Coordinates of C-alpha atoms and ligand atoms in Angstrom, one line a residue:
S493 CA 0.0 -0.1 0.0
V494 CA 1.0 3.7 0.3
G495 CA 1.2 4.8 3.9
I496 CA 1.2 8.3 5.4
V497 CA 2.4 9.2 9.2
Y498 CA -0.5 10.9 11.0
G499 CA -2.2 11.0 14.4
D500 CA -4.1 13.3 16.7
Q501 CA -1.1 13.8 19.0
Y502 CA 1.4 13.9 16.1
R503 CA -0.7 16.8 14.5
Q504 CA -0.7 18.9 17.6
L505 CA 3.1 18.6 18.0
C506 CA 4.1 19.1 14.4
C507 CA 1.9 22.5 14.6
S508 CA 3.6 23.6 17.9
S509 CA 6.6 25.4 16.6
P510 CA 6.7 29.3 16.3
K511 CA 8.5 28.9 12.5
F512 CA 6.1 26.4 11.0
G513 CA 2.9 27.0 13.1
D514 CA -0.1 25.0 11.7
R515 CA 1.6 24.2 8.3
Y516 CA 1.1 20.6 8.9
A517 CA -2.6 20.7 9.7
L518 CA -3.3 22.6 6.5
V519 CA -1.3 19.9 4.6
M520 CA -3.3 17.1 6.2
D521 CA -6.6 18.6 6.1
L522 CA -6.4 19.4 2.3
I523 CA -5.3 15.9 1.8
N524 CA -8.4 14.7 3.6
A525 CA -10.7 17.2 1.9
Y526 CA -9.5 15.7 -1.5
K527 CA -10.8 12.3 0.0
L528 CA -7.3 10.7 -0.2
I529 CA -7.3 9.6 3.2
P530 CA -9.2 6.5 2.6
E531 CA -6.7 5.3 -0.1
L532 CA -3.7 5.7 2.3
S533 CA -2.3 3.3 5.2
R534 CA -2.1 5.4 8.5
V535 CA 1.4 4.8 9.9
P536 CA 1.4 5.4 13.7
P537 CA 4.5 7.5 14.9
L538 CA 6.9 5.4 16.9
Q539 CA 6.8 5.1 20.6
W540 CA 8.9 3.7 22.8
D541 CA 9.0 1.5 26.0
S542 CA 11.2 3.7 28.2
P543 CA 13.2 6.8 28.2
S544 CA 16.2 4.5 27.8
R545 CA 15.0 3.2 24.5
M546 CA 14.0 6.6 23.3
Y547 CA 17.5 7.9 24.0
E548 CA 18.9 4.7 22.4
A549 CA 17.1 5.4 19.1
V550 CA 17.9 9.2 18.9
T551 CA 21.6 8.7 19.8
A552 CA 22.1 6.5 17.0
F553 CA 23.0 9.7 15.3
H554 CA 22.8 12.5 17.8
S555 CA 25.4 12.7 20.9
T556 CA 23.9 12.1 24.3
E557 CA 25.1 15.6 25.5
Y558 CA 23.1 17.4 22.6
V559 CA 19.8 15.5 23.3
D560 CA 20.3 16.4 27.1
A561 CA 20.5 20.0 26.2
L562 CA 17.6 20.0 23.9
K563 CA 15.3 18.3 26.6
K564 CA 16.8 20.9 29.1
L565 CA 16.0 23.6 26.7
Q566 CA 12.3 22.5 26.6
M567 CA 12.1 22.2 30.4
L568 CA 13.7 25.7 30.8
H569 CA 11.2 27.2 28.5
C570 CA 8.1 25.8 30.6
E571 CA 9.3 28.0 33.1
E572 CA 9.0 31.8 33.5
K573 CA 12.3 32.6 34.6
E574 CA 15.1 33.8 32.3
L575 CA 17.9 31.6 31.4
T576 CA 20.9 31.9 33.6
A577 CA 24.3 32.9 31.7
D578 CA 25.6 29.4 32.2
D579 CA 22.6 27.9 30.3
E580 CA 22.9 30.4 27.6
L581 CA 26.3 29.2 27.0
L582 CA 25.5 25.6 27.1
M583 CA 22.7 26.1 24.5
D584 CA 24.9 28.1 22.3
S585 CA 27.6 25.4 22.4
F586 CA 25.0 23.4 20.4
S587 CA 23.6 26.2 18.2
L588 CA 20.3 26.2 20.2
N589 CA 19.8 30.0 19.6
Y590 CA 18.9 32.5 16.8
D591 CA 17.6 30.6 14.3
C592 CA 16.9 27.3 16.4
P593 CA 15.7 29.1 19.6
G594 CA 13.7 27.3 22.5
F595 CA 10.1 27.1 22.8
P596 CA 7.9 25.2 25.4
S597 CA 7.6 22.1 23.1
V598 CA 10.9 22.3 21.4
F599 CA 12.0 18.6 22.2
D600 CA 8.6 17.1 21.8
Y601 CA 8.3 18.8 18.3
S602 CA 11.6 17.8 17.2
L603 CA 11.1 14.2 18.5
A604 CA 8.0 14.0 16.8
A605 CA 9.4 14.1 13.2
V606 CA 12.0 11.2 14.4
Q607 CA 9.0 9.4 15.6
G608 CA 7.1 9.5 12.4
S609 CA 10.1 8.9 10.0
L610 CA 11.4 5.9 12.1
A611 CA 7.9 4.3 12.0
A612 CA 7.9 5.2 8.2
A613 CA 11.3 3.4 7.7
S614 CA 9.9 0.4 9.7
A615 CA 6.9 0.1 7.5
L616 CA 9.0 -0.3 4.3
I617 CA 11.4 -2.5 6.0
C618 CA 8.5 -5.1 7.1
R619 CA 7.1 -4.6 3.5
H620 CA 3.6 -3.4 5.0
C621 CA 3.8 -0.2 2.6
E622 CA 5.7 0.0 -0.7
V623 CA 5.8 4.0 -0.2
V624 CA 5.4 5.8 2.9
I625 CA 5.0 9.6 3.2
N626 CA 5.6 11.9 6.3
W627 CA 4.8 15.4 5.8
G628 CA 6.1 16.2 9.5
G629 CA 9.7 15.1 8.7
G630 CA 12.3 16.1 6.5
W631 CA 14.7 18.0 8.8
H632 CA 17.9 17.7 6.7
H633 CA 20.2 20.3 8.4
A634 CA 20.5 19.0 12.2
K635 CA 24.0 17.6 12.8
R636 CA 25.2 15.0 15.4
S637 CA 25.5 18.0 18.0
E638 CA 24.3 20.9 16.3
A639 CA 20.8 22.6 15.5
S640 CA 20.8 24.1 12.3
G641 CA 18.4 25.9 9.8
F642 CA 15.3 25.5 11.9
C643 CA 16.1 21.7 12.5
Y644 CA 16.9 20.3 15.9
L645 CA 16.8 16.6 15.2
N646 CA 17.7 14.9 11.8
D647 CA 14.9 12.3 11.4
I648 CA 16.1 11.7 7.8
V649 CA 19.5 10.5 9.0
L650 CA 17.8 8.3 11.9
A651 CA 15.3 6.9 9.1
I652 CA 18.1 6.2 6.7
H653 CA 20.4 4.3 9.4
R654 CA 17.4 2.2 10.0
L655 CA 17.0 1.2 6.4
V656 CA 20.5 0.4 5.7
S657 CA 20.9 -1.6 8.7
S658 CA 17.8 -3.7 7.6
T659 CA 18.8 -6.7 5.3
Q660 CA 24.2 -5.6 0.6
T661 CA 21.6 -2.9 1.3
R662 CA 22.1 0.5 -0.4
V663 CA 20.1 3.7 0.1
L664 CA 19.6 6.6 -2.5
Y665 CA 18.9 9.8 -0.7
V666 CA 17.4 12.6 -3.1
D667 CA 17.1 16.0 -1.5
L668 CA 14.6 18.3 -3.9
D669 CA 14.7 21.1 -1.0
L670 CA 15.7 24.7 -2.2
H671 CA 18.8 24.2 0.3
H672 CA 21.7 21.9 0.2
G673 CA 20.9 18.8 2.3
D674 CA 24.2 19.4 4.3
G675 CA 23.3 17.4 7.4
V676 CA 22.4 14.2 5.8
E677 CA 25.4 14.5 3.3
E678 CA 27.7 14.9 6.3
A679 CA 26.2 12.1 8.2
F680 CA 27.0 9.6 5.6
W681 CA 30.1 11.2 4.2
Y682 CA 32.3 8.1 4.8
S683 CA 29.4 5.5 3.9
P684 CA 29.3 4.2 0.3
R685 CA 25.9 2.3 1.1
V686 CA 24.1 5.7 1.5
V687 CA 24.6 7.8 -1.7
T688 CA 23.2 11.3 -1.4
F689 CA 22.1 13.5 -4.1
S690 CA 21.0 17.4 -3.3
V691 CA 19.9 19.9 -6.0
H692 CA 19.6 23.3 -4.7
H693 CA 20.6 26.9 -5.0
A694 CA 23.9 28.0 -3.9
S695 CA 25.3 31.4 -4.0
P696 CA 27.5 33.5 -1.8
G697 CA 25.9 34.0 1.6
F698 CA 23.0 31.8 0.9
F699 CA 22.4 29.0 3.5
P700 CA 24.1 26.8 4.3
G701 CA 26.9 27.5 1.9
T702 CA 27.8 23.8 1.1
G703 CA 26.9 21.9 -2.0
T704 CA 28.9 23.8 -4.4
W705 CA 32.7 24.4 -5.6
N706 CA 35.0 24.3 -2.4
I707 CA 36.7 21.7 -6.8
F708 CA 33.5 19.7 -5.6
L709 CA 34.1 17.4 -2.3
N710 CA 32.4 14.4 -2.7
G711 CA 32.9 12.1 0.4
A712 CA 36.0 10.5 2.0
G713 CA 37.4 7.2 2.8
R714 CA 35.3 4.4 1.5
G715 CA 32.8 7.0 0.9
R716 CA 34.5 8.8 -1.7
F717 CA 32.5 9.8 -4.7
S718 CA 29.3 9.0 -2.7
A719 CA 28.1 12.4 -2.1
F720 CA 26.5 14.2 -5.2
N721 CA 25.3 17.9 -5.6
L722 CA 23.8 19.9 -8.2
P723 CA 23.7 23.7 -7.5
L724 CA 21.5 25.7 -9.8
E725 CA 21.1 29.3 -10.4
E726 CA 18.1 31.4 -9.0
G727 CA 15.3 31.7 -11.5
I728 CA 15.1 28.2 -12.9
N729 CA 11.7 27.0 -14.3
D730 CA 9.9 23.6 -14.2
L731 CA 11.3 22.5 -17.3
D732 CA 14.9 23.3 -16.8
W733 CA 15.0 22.1 -13.4
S734 CA 13.6 18.8 -14.7
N735 CA 16.0 18.4 -17.5
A736 CA 18.8 19.2 -15.2
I737 CA 17.8 16.5 -12.7
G738 CA 16.3 13.8 -14.8
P739 CA 19.2 12.1 -16.2
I740 CA 21.0 12.3 -12.9
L741 CA 18.2 10.4 -11.2
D742 CA 17.9 7.7 -13.9
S743 CA 21.6 7.1 -13.9
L744 CA 21.9 7.0 -10.1
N745 CA 19.3 4.4 -10.0
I746 CA 21.0 2.3 -12.8
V747 CA 24.3 2.2 -11.2
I748 CA 23.6 2.1 -7.6
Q749 CA 20.5 -0.1 -7.5
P750 CA 19.4 1.0 -4.4
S751 CA 17.3 -1.0 -1.9
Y752 CA 15.5 2.1 -0.8
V753 CA 14.9 5.4 -1.9
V754 CA 14.5 8.7 0.4
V755 CA 13.1 11.7 -0.9
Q756 CA 13.2 15.2 0.8
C757 CA 10.7 17.3 -0.9
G758 CA 11.0 20.6 0.6
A759 CA 8.5 23.0 -0.9
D760 CA 10.5 26.2 -0.9
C761 CA 11.5 25.8 -4.7
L762 CA 7.9 27.0 -5.5
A763 CA 8.0 30.1 -7.4
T764 CA 5.3 31.5 -4.7
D765 CA 7.6 30.6 -1.7
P766 CA 8.7 33.9 0.1
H767 CA 12.1 33.0 -1.0
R768 CA 11.4 33.3 -4.3
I769 CA 14.7 31.7 -5.7
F770 CA 13.4 28.9 -7.9
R771 CA 10.2 29.1 -10.1
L772 CA 8.7 25.7 -9.6
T773 CA 5.1 25.0 -9.5
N774 CA 2.6 22.3 -8.6
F775 CA 0.9 22.2 -12.0
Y776 CA 0.0 18.7 -13.5
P777 CA -1.1 19.0 -17.0
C778 CA 2.0 23.4 -20.4
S779 CA 4.4 23.3 -17.5
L780 CA 4.7 20.1 -15.4
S781 CA 5.9 20.5 -12.0
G782 CA 9.5 19.7 -11.3
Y783 CA 8.4 18.2 -8.1
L784 CA 5.7 15.7 -9.9
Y785 CA 8.3 14.9 -12.6
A786 CA 11.0 13.8 -10.1
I787 CA 8.6 11.9 -7.9
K788 CA 7.0 10.3 -10.9
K789 CA 10.4 9.3 -12.1
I790 CA 11.6 7.9 -8.8
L791 CA 8.6 6.0 -8.3
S792 CA 8.8 4.3 -11.7
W793 CA 11.7 2.5 -10.4
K794 CA 9.5 0.4 -8.1
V795 CA 11.8 0.6 -5.1
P796 CA 10.3 1.2 -1.6
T797 CA 10.4 4.7 -0.9
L798 CA 10.1 7.2 1.7
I799 CA 8.8 10.6 1.1
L800 CA 9.6 13.4 3.4
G801 CA 8.5 17.0 3.9
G802 CA 11.2 19.9 4.6
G803 CA 11.2 23.6 3.9
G804 CA 8.1 25.4 2.5
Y805 CA 7.1 28.8 4.1
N806 CA 3.9 29.6 2.0
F807 CA 1.8 27.2 3.9
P808 CA -1.2 26.7 1.5
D809 CA 1.0 26.6 -1.4
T810 CA 3.2 23.8 0.5
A811 CA -0.4 22.1 1.0
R812 CA -1.1 22.5 -2.7
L813 CA 1.9 20.8 -3.7
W814 CA 2.2 17.9 -1.1
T815 CA -1.4 17.2 -1.7
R816 CA -0.5 16.6 -5.5
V817 CA 2.4 14.6 -4.5
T818 CA 0.4 12.4 -2.5
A819 CA -2.3 11.9 -5.1
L820 CA 0.4 11.1 -7.6
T821 CA 2.1 8.5 -5.3
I822 CA -1.4 6.7 -4.9
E823 CA -1.9 6.6 -8.6
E824 CA 1.6 5.3 -9.4
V825 CA 1.9 2.6 -6.6
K826 CA -1.8 1.3 -7.0
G827 CA -2.3 1.9 -10.8
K828 CA -5.5 3.8 -9.8
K829 CA -6.6 7.1 -11.3
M830 CA -6.8 9.9 -8.7
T831 CA -9.0 13.0 -9.9
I832 CA -8.6 16.1 -8.3
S833 CA -10.9 19.1 -8.6
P834 CA -9.0 22.1 -9.9
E835 CA -11.1 23.7 -7.2
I836 CA -10.0 23.6 -3.3
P837 CA -13.1 21.8 -1.6
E838 CA -14.8 23.2 1.3
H839 CA -13.1 22.2 4.6
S840 CA -11.6 23.6 8.0
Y841 CA -9.0 25.8 6.3
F842 CA -10.7 26.7 3.1
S843 CA -10.5 30.4 3.8
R844 CA -6.6 30.2 3.8
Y845 CA -6.7 29.3 0.1
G846 CA -8.4 32.7 -1.3
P847 CA -9.0 34.7 -3.1
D848 CA -9.4 32.2 -5.8
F849 CA -9.6 28.8 -4.0
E850 CA -7.8 26.9 -6.8
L851 CA -5.4 24.0 -6.4
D852 CA -2.8 25.5 -8.7
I853 CA -0.5 27.9 -7.2
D854 CA -1.0 31.5 -8.4
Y855 CA 1.9 31.9 -10.8
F856 CA 2.5 32.3 -14.5
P857 CA 5.6 30.7 -15.8
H858 CA 8.1 32.0 -18.3
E859 CA 11.7 31.2 -19.1
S860 CA 14.5 30.7 -16.6
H861 CA 16.7 33.8 -15.8
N862 CA 19.9 32.3 -17.2
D863 CA 25.9 25.1 -20.7
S864 CA 26.5 25.4 -17.0
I865 CA 24.3 22.6 -16.6
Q866 CA 26.0 20.5 -19.3
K867 CA 29.4 20.9 -17.4
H868 CA 27.6 19.8 -14.2
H869 CA 26.3 16.7 -16.1
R870 CA 30.0 15.8 -17.3
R871 CA 31.2 16.1 -13.8
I872 CA 28.6 13.9 -12.3
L873 CA 28.9 11.4 -14.7
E874 CA 32.6 11.1 -14.3
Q875 CA 32.0 11.1 -10.4
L876 CA 29.3 8.3 -10.9
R877 CA 32.1 6.3 -12.9
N878 CA 34.6 6.8 -10.2
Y879 CA 32.0 5.6 -7.5
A880 CA 31.1 2.7 -9.5
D881 CA 34.9 1.8 -10.1
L882 CA 35.7 2.3 -6.5
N883 CA 33.0 0.1 -5.2
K884 CA 33.2 -2.6 -8.0
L885 CA 29.7 -2.1 -9.5
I886 CA 29.1 -3.1 -13.0
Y887 CA 27.1 -1.0 -15.4
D888 CA 26.8 -0.2 -19.0
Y889 CA 28.9 3.0 -19.5
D890 CA 27.1 3.9 -22.6
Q891 CA 23.6 2.9 -21.6
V892 CA 24.2 5.6 -18.8
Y893 CA 26.1 8.1 -20.9
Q894 CA 23.2 8.1 -23.5
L895 CA 20.7 9.3 -20.7
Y896 CA 22.2 12.5 -21.0
Ligands
GOK2349 C1 16.2 38.3 10.4 N1 17.2 37.5 11.0 C2 18.2 37.0 10.5 C3 18.8 35.9 11.2 C4 19.9 35.3 11.3 N2 19.9 34.0 10.7 C5 19.0 33.9 9.4 C6 19.5 32.8 8.7 C7 18.7 32.6 7.1 C8 18.7 31.5 6.2 N3 18.4 30.4 7.1 C9 17.7 29.2 6.7 N4 17.7 28.2 7.3 C10 17.0 27.2 6.8 C11 16.1 27.4 5.8 C12 15.8 26.1 4.9 O1 14.6 26.3 4.4 N5 16.3 25.1 4.9 O2 16.2 23.8 4.1 C13 16.3 28.5 5.2 N6 17.0 29.5 5.8 C14 19.4 30.3 8.3 C15 19.3 31.6 9.2 C16 17.8 35.7 12.3 C17 17.9 35.2 13.7 C18 16.8 35.5 14.6 C19 16.0 36.1 14.5 C20 15.6 37.0 13.1 C21 16.8 36.9 12.3
K2350 K1 18.2 20.1 -1.9
K2351 K1 27.6 9.0 1.3
ZN2352 ZN1 14.8 24.8 2.4

């Protein structure tokens, strides 16, 4: 089946942060309003038998001292008194500040995404679902002992760790967010069994700064050549982004033959995101949403797949996109046509979709603002060949080369 992570408490926690407000509720209620929930298997977020078991799961990636500090940060924000200077310094040492501040549910909020993505991984491993969706996860920036980019715990790294440790198992990670998936790339820098691929904007001063010329670094030790990046200029439209990523995705699948795919589907590439860097849409025809193009291509491989959320700061338009991703996933997995009215159906959050209440985002596409892509394709092809040689994988050089 196709699974999707949700639950009443999960919803409450995913809506408890100051940065993302009620975004997750709009997403799930739009999916519900389009009558997709009966098509999907509800995957309950993972809960544990003890604090010790919870700590063991989270510290599979994060340090105990970071988890301790994150939990203390929540406690401190549930009291009225200011932090002590010593406690401010402690939080600063884990970057729990400015961009990743405390709030009264910061630990339960961050943990909830881990709970959802670990449960989603398990549903794939046991074969209950062929694809699982978690629109409350996808927090790709968090590091072993560091919060970053509004991300406190890296549910993606933990989910991937659970997948690769199941039964050689290789995972392909595809990061469609506007920003470079640095936390996941770093976690698996030395691992050839998790190949990471991020497409993103990069430019001077733009967060987080990595995923671009440094030459291109691409892994180390036995993980050399296993970290792939495609930085793209601002203004790119659906078609040019699709043509940029398409052959790379196909060639990665052919060469790596992954046991699982994990996709991060951050919605901040939309033309209507307040970032306004890329000009992608959620259109499903004559522009085809780059997101929908990529997901359809990944799902055509018939590999068990985890689809995660991420960025997306225009909440109604993030719901508009992820509702279409969810419908496409049902259609591709079950072979069952999903017809979606171009008109937003009545439901709790209908007023948020004004003034015109249509499923398409309110945007009029045109040509990209910007040869460079061809150089990147040559570089990535060479890196893939290097990866395959280092890891003794066999592959038709010219079937792969002809994809470009
Ligand atoms: C305006 N203003 C600027 C700052 C300093 N930090 C800003 C950067 C902006 C850029 N930034 C950031 N992180 C993640 C994402 C994302 O979507 N990742 O997939 C996007 N953007 C880091 C933080 C700041 C801190 C607190 C309050 C206001 C403040
Ligand atoms: K990305
Ligand atoms: K890697
Ligand atoms: Zn982002």
